[PDB]
Enzyme design. Structure first.
Site: not given
Ligand code: NA
Length: 129
Positions: A35, A46, A48, A50, A52, A59
């Site tokens: 990650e 991301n 969309d 959002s 992380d 998220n």
């Protein structure tokens, strides 16, 4: 902070992640490696809108508030920035909420694709725990 592999394992163990909801420590270390490459300051946007955050790439659509993810929730009740700290406590405490949500560690796409069904105990081999 960029953790060493064993340093992170020890930190996670101390914070109650070894066998948390049945996921052995190597699972958590493996997910962190892929990650964030063990960097607590990791961020990634991301499609969309959002983002992380942190060592476990939590998220903002669901779990934390970053002030820029419209229509999102803050289920861990924390600013997303708290997830970037060298102190992993907030990331771990939030991860325990996430892994309890229904889908286990499958919530972490990198866990599912890179760790699941592999020898994850390799991630903690050699560490003093
Ligand atoms: Na949010």
């Amino acid at each position: 902070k960029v953790f060493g592999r064993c340093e992170l394992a020890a930190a996670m163990k101390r914070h109650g992640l070894d066998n948390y909801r049945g996921y052995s420590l190597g699972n958590w270390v493996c997910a962190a490696k892929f990650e964030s490459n063990f960097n607590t300051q990791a961020t990634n946007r991301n499609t969309d809108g959002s983002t992380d955050y942190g060592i476990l790439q939590i998220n903002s659509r669901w779990w934390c508030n970053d002030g820029r993810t419209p229509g999102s929730r803050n289920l861990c009740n924390i600013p997303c920035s708290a997830l970037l700290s060298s102190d992993i406590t907030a990331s771990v405490n939030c991860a325990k909420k996430i892994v309890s949500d229904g889908n286990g560690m499958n919530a972490w796409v990198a866990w599912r694709n890179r760790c699941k069904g592999t020898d994850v105990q390799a991630w903690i081999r050699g560490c003093r725990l």
